[PDB]
Design a protein around this nucleic acid. Structure first.
Lengths: 125, 155, 60, 96, 78, 206, 23
RNA sequence: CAGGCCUUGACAUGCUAGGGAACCCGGGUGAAAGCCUGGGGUGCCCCGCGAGGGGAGCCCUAGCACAGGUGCUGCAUGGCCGUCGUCAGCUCGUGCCGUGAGGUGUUGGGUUAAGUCCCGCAACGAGCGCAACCCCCGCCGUUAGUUGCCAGCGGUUCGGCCGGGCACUCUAACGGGACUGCCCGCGAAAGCGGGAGGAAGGAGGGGACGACGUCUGGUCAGCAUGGCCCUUACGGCCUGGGCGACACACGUGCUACAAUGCCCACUACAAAGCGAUGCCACCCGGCAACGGGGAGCUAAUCGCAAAAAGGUGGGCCCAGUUCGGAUUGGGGUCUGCAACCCGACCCCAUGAAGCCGGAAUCGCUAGUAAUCGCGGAUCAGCCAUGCCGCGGUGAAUACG
């Protein structure tokens, strides 16, 4: 019925269900275009659908929790690049060579005692 | 990079035209990280390359880059006890950064009301031979060659 | 004025604003951690000896 | 609802498989070990006695919560778990 | 609602103005508010070192005690 | 100053706490306030005996008051005499059900705080201090040791110029977490000032 | 901005409400 | 610091003479302190019906032996921290060269972040140091489900609400995994370039850890500590002041000088934590601060709580301005005995400088800088723009 992909990228959680068909997209109970309005990074995690030509092989149901607007986006990018290699384990071809797999450990750093914002050191004489 | 060659990062394409040089101008239009505001101002002004002088927002940008990219520059070096500005060919990577940057500066300084309004205008005029970044490109270039007296004072 | 002082924190006087956190093994007035009852340098040397119940040195 | 509090987890996770293992042998039917998000209290301290704000250090208080439920209660269940193996540093809780 | 005057001074005050208006009440209460009975007297208020007297008038009724005998000595710089 | 306390480093890496119990917001300071109170009575009138650590446990008015020690008799006496009048003086302030305990130290020449307050007592005794550090270290390797390290700090012998005396035969890799090293500190107050004394016994890996 | 109390940005930075930022 | 008090003292141990004890309430005064003073009446081990007693808690007075001192000395100190410096060092053992200081090793050729390893060698070993084991993060699993969940069905008053379920998400414990281990390239070896598979490769990101030592570094004011010195005062209590003074001088910072902006409506998406004489849901009253009423939580289930930016679409139109929030006047609230000196929060009005800064200088290499909001501690309240954290948007560049 579905195809499932676990997505995260920097304190974000994006649960995807590549339920086949037309290509309509809902996250958290609304069209992808309603939620993600304004955003130009918002077109998007539907790009893994552009690495296996399947804009017209899948509608989408997604749940998402954490981080922010464009930080959630990169989660569904791991959530749509995983829900396609699950459907066709022969589709990681043109997915990891196209770099849509993996999961970026690019996390915001612990603020350091002394440096005003992790590294932005105090001004001295 | 006393040690290494200092890694050159590739950029993303831009979802709208899939161009790694369109992300490179929008990053230099950026301010305070607010990239969502950085991106409108292109397509706000790309629309201004389309409304005014009906053409190709893809191609007026890519010309305005080659119309501000400086092939010869001069950096000052210390010899004897002298401050000689050395004639050198500015590398292609230096060019990109050099082209885009003057392009934001010259545009920001413009006497027009909205940000993109300037951005477009400048891009148009750069390809047309007459911009603010276009003066600056010739300034550096003829600042060089005026200084070819220091050509073997080049590394 | 110091010891007769630490006595003065032990005896609540004329008002309820007028009380403060002095200290126990320290006679220390400032940087008093009330959860621990300990005065920043009281706290730290006993945290290293381990005389503080399950109080780890962090690292993350 | 046998809400097991504590500081040390390795001592706390030996007795929450103890009232897990032993009530199952003594009734039914033991909710397996559930781990609550540990509530952390930190202490950042100027290492030196005097001034030296530039140099400090980090100490934390990890008090990890643990809940466990008894499904079909029974007698002998609260008398097998009336007298329980300690340890010196674990907190109990009884409900239903 | 709320107005504060110590009440060791307003005790004398409503005992002094009552029992024959004199003046010259010395006190260590600049925290008090100069209630309108104090009008026309002489309170010697303590700024810390000195008991500066004040001749109480109408021109300052809802006013406090310690503004009226300042603690610091200025005169100038140079 | 630039070094970390080799113990507080290992509190859950090698060694372990000495009030190993649980509490929270309501009552944390008061059982802990008691602990130091316990340690004041027990570090005084349990000196001339040994005493290297105090492991303390709590329940619900059950404070366990366990002593590590070099010589147990000086806690219990004869028949059971002292360990009971110690379980009469302590269970007064502690307000609860005490339990004054004893566990004998397998060679007090591998216990470091023992290695310490011995060698520092030898400072207030006005001995060859230098030769004592070479001595007390020497003894500890002589009785099963992978390494040791002692440091004496202050008016060494009394001399006005404040020195730092130092000795360490055998490996002590303080930078390691699985290093197991016992450490203690001895405070020799003298005819002329206070001398610092340290202790560092590499006991083996883990 | 964040120092002009009599507005929205002024209360927020500050940690306050009233008219120009209410609850 | 000023004024007013107390002398064995605010605190400790002990001995001695008289009371006598505990303990609770006044009276008078005084700014408070303190001073003087009117009540009740002690279990107990006790000859004892008794008069009455012995002794002992706890108290007073007197008199000591003493206290107390943030007074001086951080070159008489401990301890702890700062610092060079995460820098790649600094040493021993024996052997050997040298009359000796000392050297040799540790130097040299090759390579790492590194005394990183490899090879050479009158050297061969060895320690403290780097690394490793520890934490955090990033991939996957086991264990576990009152936090998640139409992913699954039914019902859904339509709030995951009920059932119902652990697959998820999440939680938090134990595990797995990277090893230049596999190939290609070169190299005597180590090792470098490049490839694949891989969630991540070449210390994957950060933390913690910082050598013998140096700076007669810093703290006697956290604490202790040798000594000097003060013992109706250098002790101590108290009321009030000062620590917040202002002709000026420098450091760290906050908010700006606007339109990539401000303003107003409305609409989304975090994380870390903290919550009982606490967090305060929700109504009512107030332009509001707040003020009532009042529900729930020992807290992954109640609460702080709003994130902000952003997005939508309207206001402003280049104006010292709807830029910027200083200053002052007035009316207010809350904490608190008490906001004159000296508190924050609110409402109205006043709306100064400032149109981006001379000479000079600081920070930062990737999720960093920039920008944005949130917590916490200490704290009644608060002068936090500080500090310690948390995450949101997210770059620039590196020939050398």
């Amino acid at each position: 019925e579905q195809y499932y992909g676990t997505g995260r990228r920097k304190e974000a959680v994006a649960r995807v269900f590549l339920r086949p068909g037309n290509g309509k997209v809902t996250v958290n109970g609304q069209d992808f275009n309603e939620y993600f309005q304004g955003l130009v990074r918002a077109v998007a995690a539907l790009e893994p659908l552009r690495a296996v030509d399947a804009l017209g092989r899948f509608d989408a149901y997604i749940t998402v929790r954490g981080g922010g607007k464009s930080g959630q986006i990169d989660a569904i990018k791991l959530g749509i690049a995983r829900a396609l290699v699950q459907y066709n384990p022969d589709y990681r071809a043109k997915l990891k060579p196209l770099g849509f797999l993996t999961r970026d450990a690019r996390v915001v750093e612990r603020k350091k005692y002394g440096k005003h914002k992790a590294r932005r050191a105090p001004q001295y004489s | 990079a006393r040690r290494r060659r200092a890694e050159v990062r590739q950029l993303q394409p831009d979802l709208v035209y899939g161009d790694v040089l369109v992300t490179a101008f929008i990053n230099k239009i950026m301010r305070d990280g607010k990239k969502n505001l950085a991106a409108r101002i292109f397509y706000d002004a790309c629309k201004i390359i389309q409304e005014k002088t009906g053409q190709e927002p893809l191609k007026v940008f890519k010309q305005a880059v080659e119309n501000v990219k400086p092939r010869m520059e001069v950096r000052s070096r210390r010899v004897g006890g002298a401050n000689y500005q050395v004639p050198m060919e500015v590398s292609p990577r230096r060019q990109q950064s050099l082209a885009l940057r003057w392009l934001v500066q010259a545009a920001n300084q413009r006497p027009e009301r909205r940000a993109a309004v300037r951005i477009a205008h400048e891009l148009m005029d750069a390809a047309e031979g007459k911009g603010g970044a276009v003066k600056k490109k010739e300034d550096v270039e003829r600042m060089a060659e005026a200084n070819r007296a220091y050509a073997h004072y080049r590394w | 004025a110091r010891k007769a002082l630490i006595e003065k924190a032990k005896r609540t006087p004329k008002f309820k604003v007028r009380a403060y956190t002095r200290c126990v093994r320290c006679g220390r007035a400032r940087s008093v951690y009330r959860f621990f009852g300990l005065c920043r340098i009281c706290l730290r040397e006993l945290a290293h000896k381990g005389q503080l119940p399950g109080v780890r040195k962090a690292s993350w | 609802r046998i809400k097991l509090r504590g500081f040390d987890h390795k001592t706390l996770d030996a007795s929450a498989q103890k009232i897990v293992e032993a009530a199952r042998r003594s009734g039914a039917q033991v909710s397996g070990p559930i781990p609550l998000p540990t509530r952390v209290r930190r202490f950042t301290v100027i290492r030196g006695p005097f001034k030296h704000k530039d140099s400090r250090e980090h100490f934390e208080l990890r008090t990890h919560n643990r809940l466990v439920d008894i499904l079909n209660p029974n007698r002998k269940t609260i008398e097998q778990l009336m007298t329980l193996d300690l340890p010196t540093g674990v907190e109990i809780e009884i409900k239903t | 609602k709320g107005v504060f005057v110590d009440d060791h001074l307003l005790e004398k005050v409503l005992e002094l103005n009552a029992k024959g208006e004199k003046r010259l009440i010395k006190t260590w209460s600049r925290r008090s508010t100069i209630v309108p009975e104090m009008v026309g007297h002489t309170i010697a208020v303590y700024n810390g070192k000195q008991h500066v007297p004040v001749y109480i008038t109408e021109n300052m009724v809802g006013h406090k005690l310690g503004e009226f005998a300042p603690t610091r000595t200025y005169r100038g710089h140079g | 100053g630039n070094k970390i306390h080799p113990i507080g480093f290992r509190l859950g890496i090698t060694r372990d706490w000495e009030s190993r119990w649980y509490a929270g917001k309501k009552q944390y300071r008061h059982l802990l306030l008691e602990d130091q109170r316990i340690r004041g009575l027990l570090e005084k009138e349990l000196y001339s005996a040994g005493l290297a650590r105090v492991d303390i446990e709590r329940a619900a008015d059950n404070v366990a008051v366990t002593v590590h020690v070099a010589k147990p008799g000086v806690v219990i006496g004869r028949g059971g005499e002292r360990i009971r009048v110690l379980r009469e003086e302590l269970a007064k302030l502690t307000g609860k059900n005490v339990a004054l305990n004893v566990q004998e130290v397998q060679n007090p020449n591998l216990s470091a705080p023992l290695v310490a307050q011995r060698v520092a007592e030898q400072i207030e005794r006005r001995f060859a201090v230098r030769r004592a550090i070479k001595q007390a270290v020497q003894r500890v390797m002589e009785s099963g040791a992978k390494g040791a390290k002692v440091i004496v700090s202050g008016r060494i012998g009394g001399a006005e110029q404040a020195r730092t005396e130092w000795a360490a035969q055998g490996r002590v890799p303080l930078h390691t977490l699985r290093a197991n090293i016992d450490y203690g500190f001895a405070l020799a107050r003298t005819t002329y000032g206070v001398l610092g004394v340290k202790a560092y016994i590499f006991l083996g890996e883990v | 901005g964040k120092g002009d109390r009599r507005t929205r940005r002024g209360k927020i930075w500050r940690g306050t409400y009233g008219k120009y930022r209410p609850r």
